[PDB]
Design an enzyme around this catalytic site. Structure first.
Site, PDB file in Angstrom:
ATOM      1  N   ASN A 171      90.594  80.767  53.899  1.00 52.82           N
ATOM      2  CA  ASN A 171      90.635  80.142  55.209  1.00 52.82           C
ATOM      3  C   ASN A 171      92.072  80.202  55.733  1.00 52.82           C
ATOM      4  O   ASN A 171      93.011  80.062  54.964  1.00 52.82           O
ATOM      5  CB  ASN A 171      90.139  78.682  55.157  1.00 52.82           C
ATOM      6  CG  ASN A 171      88.707  78.547  54.620  1.00 52.82           C
ATOM      7  OD1 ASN A 171      87.914  79.500  54.584  1.00 52.82           O
ATOM      8  ND2 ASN A 171      88.372  77.343  54.228  1.00 52.82           N
ATOM      9  N   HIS A 218      81.177  71.310  49.905  1.00 50.12           N
ATOM     10  CA  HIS A 218      82.121  71.197  51.038  1.00 50.12           C
ATOM     11  C   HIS A 218      82.345  69.715  51.307  1.00 50.12           C
ATOM     12  O   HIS A 218      82.183  69.250  52.438  1.00 50.12           O
ATOM     13  CB  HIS A 218      81.599  71.942  52.266  1.00 50.12           C
ATOM     14  CG  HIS A 218      82.646  72.313  53.288  1.00 50.12           C
ATOM     15  ND1 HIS A 218      82.778  73.600  53.781  1.00 50.12           N
ATOM     16  CD2 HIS A 218      83.527  71.553  53.988  1.00 50.12           C
ATOM     17  CE1 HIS A 218      83.726  73.616  54.704  1.00 50.12           C
ATOM     18  NE2 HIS A 218      84.201  72.387  54.847  1.00 50.12           N
ATOM     19  N   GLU A 274      86.950  81.174  57.060  1.00 49.52           N
ATOM     20  CA  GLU A 274      87.177  80.319  58.228  1.00 49.52           C
ATOM     21  C   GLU A 274      88.419  80.777  58.966  1.00 49.52           C
ATOM     22  O   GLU A 274      89.457  81.024  58.342  1.00 49.52           O
ATOM     23  CB  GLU A 274      87.430  78.847  57.836  1.00 49.52           C
ATOM     24  CG  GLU A 274      86.231  78.080  57.321  1.00 49.52           C
ATOM     25  CD  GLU A 274      86.556  76.618  56.981  1.00 49.52           C
ATOM     26  OE1 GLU A 274      87.458  76.035  57.629  1.00 49.52           O
ATOM     27  OE2 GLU A 274      85.884  76.076  56.081  1.00 49.52           O
ATOM     28  N   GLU A 298      87.993  74.750  49.476  1.00 48.46           N
ATOM     29  CA  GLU A 298      89.335  74.183  49.576  1.00 48.46           C
ATOM     30  C   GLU A 298      89.581  73.064  48.548  1.00 48.46           C
ATOM     31  O   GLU A 298      89.779  71.910  48.935  1.00 48.46           O
ATOM     32  CB  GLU A 298      89.666  73.693  51.011  1.00 48.46           C
ATOM     33  CG  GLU A 298      89.538  74.772  52.066  1.00 48.46           C
ATOM     34  CD  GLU A 298      89.948  74.331  53.459  1.00 48.46           C
ATOM     35  OE1 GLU A 298      90.120  73.126  53.723  1.00 48.46           O
ATOM     36  OE2 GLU A 298      90.083  75.224  54.315  1.00 48.46           O
ATOM     37  N   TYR A 328      94.562  79.261  59.466  1.00 51.19           N
ATOM     38  CA  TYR A 328      94.598  78.636  60.793  1.00 51.19           C
ATOM     39  C   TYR A 328      95.955  78.629  61.452  1.00 51.19           C
ATOM     40  O   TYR A 328      96.021  78.797  62.668  1.00 51.19           O
ATOM     41  CB  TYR A 328      94.129  77.181  60.739  1.00 51.19           C
ATOM     42  CG  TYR A 328      92.648  77.020  60.528  1.00 51.19           C
ATOM     43  CD1 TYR A 328      92.086  77.183  59.280  1.00 51.19           C
ATOM     44  CD2 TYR A 328      91.816  76.722  61.592  1.00 51.19           C
ATOM     45  CE1 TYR A 328      90.729  77.041  59.103  1.00 51.19           C
ATOM     46  CE2 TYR A 328      90.460  76.581  61.422  1.00 51.19           C
ATOM     47  CZ  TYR A 328      89.934  76.738  60.169  1.00 51.19           C
ATOM     48  OH  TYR A 328      88.605  76.570  60.004  1.00 51.19           O
ATOM     49  N   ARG A 365      77.650  81.032  57.289  1.00 51.13           N
ATOM     50  CA  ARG A 365      78.167  80.242  56.184  1.00 51.13           C
ATOM     51  C   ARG A 365      77.849  78.746  56.442  1.00 51.13           C
ATOM     52  O   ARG A 365      78.284  78.178  57.432  1.00 51.13           O
ATOM     53  CB  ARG A 365      79.693  80.488  55.974  1.00 51.13           C
ATOM     54  CG  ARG A 365      80.332  79.585  54.873  1.00 51.13           C
ATOM     55  CD  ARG A 365      81.878  79.829  54.627  1.00 51.13           C
ATOM     56  NE  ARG A 365      82.397  78.855  53.662  1.00 51.13           N
ATOM     57  CZ  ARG A 365      83.393  77.981  53.850  1.00 51.13           C
ATOM     58  NH1 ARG A 365      84.133  77.951  54.966  1.00 51.13           N
ATOM     59  NH2 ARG A 365      83.652  77.107  52.885  1.00 51.13           N
TER      60      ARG A 365
END
Ligand SMILES: OC[C@@H]1[C@@H](O)[C@H](O)[C@@H](O)c2[nH]cc[n+]21
Length: 440
Positions: free
Chosen positions: A291, A119, A346, A164, A293, A75
């Site tokens: 994504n 991005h 991600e 995002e 985290y 990616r």
């Protein structure tokens, strides 16, 4: 043994401004990250993307690293201002040549390209015309996307419109922490809305131009748990999910309006006739990229929300490690919207990596983090979530936005004084995971 389905895509992920450097090479226009990071006070240590990982020159070696590791998907993102230096109109052939060479090399080596169209590096020229605040961005973005489709759609078949958009709108235009560095709540929600319309216009052009591909969109997500058993703490969590996670965008896309707790907080900030754009916004997408985290403990606080410190292991970012979050957000996306395909686009961690006398990078911290999260995504697949792939952030240590180079997310270590790459223990470990198609 936790084996993944046949053909599951194991990937690594990067972004143009974070790794490339040479932001003005070969006729490129300035982006808003160039001008933002060149403004004193905006980025830690005054770091910029001027050099980064020098991937703009070292792209072949980095790809050969992907190959050698047996990683199956890459990616990466495309710098809008390398392609159209003024954002619209003129197309820069040398910008196209840069990504063409990367695309062809990937294919020759059997690696599957996942292209993020946006991005965060908006052409500066368009920011002068309002950027994401300007309704006309729906057209500018569509014309940019069309160029990408017509040039690469013959080889690239997996496309992401936006990375995002909550971050782009809120962090760029409300918090002022990211480019273009603004602090205006009305601008920020006009950016939310325009990002939806630009995404949908791009999906529409994609259907007319690339008859064989798939296109999606990526969202940041957190695992919000309530601080207590109170109704108010539970509702605070309901708001945070609807606002910070995929519902802010997926509710418009699938259901044709913003989520209810978003309208209660923000209706005054959206355009008055925003509903007129909703039917166009519902343009059918092929996949959702999530994504993930970290998690947060959350309480009502007279935003009306604050976070609560928890003990819990944290990464170098100060982010609490909550692996069960990735399982939760995967379950919740199926439950709420049931998209036909999901990808973890991600997942990763920043730790204070050191090259030992070895010189290996013994990031057991990052191995544990990754293993844990891969395990929970396995779980989700067993309970029927259509997860087709998983992408580690990041291939390389890189420019971590307003943190600069001080945060290292790579499974490959980059020595910035030399540009030497040193595969970390986490990289070797991940390679073994891809080879075996799962955990052991
Ligand atoms: O902070 C690590 C990374 C950034 O480097 C990426 O650009 C971004 O897409 C993202 N979303 C969540 C965390 N991250």
């Amino acid at each position: 043994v936790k084996k993944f389905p046949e053909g599951f895509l194991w990937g690594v992920a990067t972004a143009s401004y974070q790794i490339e450097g040479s932001p003005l090479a070969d006729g490129a226009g300035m982006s808003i990250w160039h001008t933002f990071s060149h403004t004193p006070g905006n980025v830690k240590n005054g770091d910029t993307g001027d050099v980064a990982c020098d991937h703009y020159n070292r792209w072949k070696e980095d790809i050969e690293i992907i190959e050698k590791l047996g990683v199956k998907a890459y990616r990466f993102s495309i710098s809008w201002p390398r392609i159209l230096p003024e954002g619209t109109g003129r197309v820069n052939q040398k910008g196209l040549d840069f990504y063409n060479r990367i695309i062809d090399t990937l294919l020759e080596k059997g690696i599957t390209p996942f292209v993020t169209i946006y991005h965060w590096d908006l052409p500066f020229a368009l920011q002068l015309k309002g950027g994401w605040a300007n309704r006309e961005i729906a057209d500018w973005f569509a014309e940019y996307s069309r160029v990408l489709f017509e040039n690469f759609g013959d080889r690239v078949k997996n496309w992401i419109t936006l990375n995002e958009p909550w971050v782009v709108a809120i962090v760029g235009h409300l918090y002022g922490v990211h480019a273009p560095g603004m602090r205006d709540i009305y601008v920020a929600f006009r950016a939310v809305h325009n990002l939806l319309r630009a995404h949908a216009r791009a999906v529409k052009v994609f259907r007319e131009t690339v008859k064989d591909g798939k296109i999606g969109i990526v969202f940041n997500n957190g695992y919000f748990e309530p601080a207590s058993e109170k109704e108010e703490d539970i509702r605070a969590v309901r708001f945070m999910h609807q606002f910070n996670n995929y519902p802010l965008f997926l509710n418009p896309i699938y259901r044709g309006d913003y989520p209810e707790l978003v309208l209660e907080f923000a209706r005054e900030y959206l355009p008055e006739n925003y509903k007129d754009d909703m039917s166009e916004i519902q343009e059918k997408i092929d996949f959702v990229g999530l994504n993930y985290y970290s998690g947060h403990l959350v309480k009502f606080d007279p935003a009306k929300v604050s976070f609560v410190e928890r003990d819990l292991p944290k990464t170098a970012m100060g982010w609490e490690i909550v692996p069960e979050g990735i399982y939760w957000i995967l379950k919740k996306v199926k439950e709420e919207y049931n998209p036909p395909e999901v990808y973890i686009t991600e997942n990763g961690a920043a730790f204070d990596d050191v090259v030992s006398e070895d010189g290996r990078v013994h990031d057991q911290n990052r191995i544990d983090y990754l293993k844990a999260h891969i395990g929970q995504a396995w779980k989700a697949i067993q309970e029927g979530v259509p997860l087709k792939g998983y992408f580690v952030w990041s291939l390389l240590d890189n420019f971590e936005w307003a943190e600069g180079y001080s945060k290292r997310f790579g499974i490959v270590y980059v020595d910035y004084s030399t540009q030497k790459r040193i595969v970390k223990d986490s990289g070797y470990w991940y390679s073994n995971v891809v080879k075996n198609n799962g955990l052991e």
